[PDB]
Amino acid sequence: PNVPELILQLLQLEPDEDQVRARILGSDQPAAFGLLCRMADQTFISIVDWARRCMVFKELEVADQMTLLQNCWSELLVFDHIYRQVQHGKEGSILLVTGQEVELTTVATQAGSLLHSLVLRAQELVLQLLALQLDRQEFVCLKFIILFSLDLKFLNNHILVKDAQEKANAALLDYTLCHYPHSGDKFQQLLLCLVEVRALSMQAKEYLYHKHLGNEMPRNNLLIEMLQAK
Template identity: 35%
Template sequence: MKREAVQEERQKAKDKNNEDQVESSTSVNSDMPLEKILNAQLAVEPVNDTYIDAPDNAIQNICQAADHQLVSLVDWAKRIPHFIDLNLKDQVALLKSSWNELLIINFCHRSVAVEEGLLLSTGLHIHRSSAHQAGVGVVFDRVLTELVAKMRHMKMDKTELGCLRTIILFNPDAKGLRDARKIESLREKVYGNLEEYCKQKYPKEPGRFAMLLLRLPTLRSIGLKCIEHLFFLKLIGDTPIDNFLIEILDYNQHCHGKS
């Protein structure tokens, strides 16, 4: 089952881009450099590593953290190679398709440092008991056991985190894309980049790349559950997320002279 899940993740990007498979690892790395992916991740991470226990309102605290992180999420995406070269509608479509998963995986990786809870970007630590009191204990426990615990066990590093987030971002199945083929090609380059990185950085862990990819279906499932449980209901006041993303991206492009 696990092998099938890994193959499915990669096959989605391969089916329509078989011609890209002849590229060498050098070509992939030069076009989608790990350094830029890592730097993008580091640039938007909270500077303060300290945290405090949050009040009991778990859902409100998570929503506030999501609100705060949506702005930095756009900043992160703009730093990912080739993202700002896409047309504005595709940028919005990609972020709209992936924002909840991108926020969750960040929360989870940050939470590796704590026990029995989530460490939010705002510095608040939400204990699982608070989540259970708020009625979201089931999905909260899934986050802890299927994502945080797995990341902690394999000691997922920030380069791997950045690559997984980039794979999530470049979703060729996002609704409303004008150039899905281009997105597929970009995602496949990240796959190749990450696989090569795992081989070189962790030569004694031949299954590491597969273990990383196995987090993606789990993350997708949990992301849907989080939406169902209204984890991210209160986002930017009454502003629809589409409009919010367009405003941020459009403003940024004007500031940088892009049409």
């Protein structure tokens, strides 16, 4: 009944859709590829500032922060999109952070095979999460889990990163056991959906690489700069 304190603080740090819908803005017919690209780039910037405000992450050195964010940027973008579909919008349409809704018909007719496949599998994951009744507390907790999903070996500060991982998983478990009276083990099935999200985000990386080899993306697209970090 009592939600863990970790989740309470993460909720307090979650910027409600209002404000970065606002700021992303101001910054039928064929789909505007380039402005959708810049929209994804602004989404990534808002996610990086969210991370900057987070617990534990705020105490690490910039190198460890860079390592962590380099390991999960695509995953966090995809998860933000999926939770945007869960929380709002219809299953005949996809909602984008600007508030625009794109119907799956438009995707099927305009998109290539791989983007189409990716949107479809994202909708599959959305349905999965709806069936397990994913809620905002779980969303922020899973975001925090993804952020620290990197193995300790690649980081200088093992102690704090591992404390964060442990406490995040404990918070999720405690919350699911106390608020989810149904059967299934929501903890484990949420974690396996995170597995699926990471796979989908790898596919998204492949899509962006395909666009880059064809020189179809804007010149200074930030997702392409992250893709090439090595």
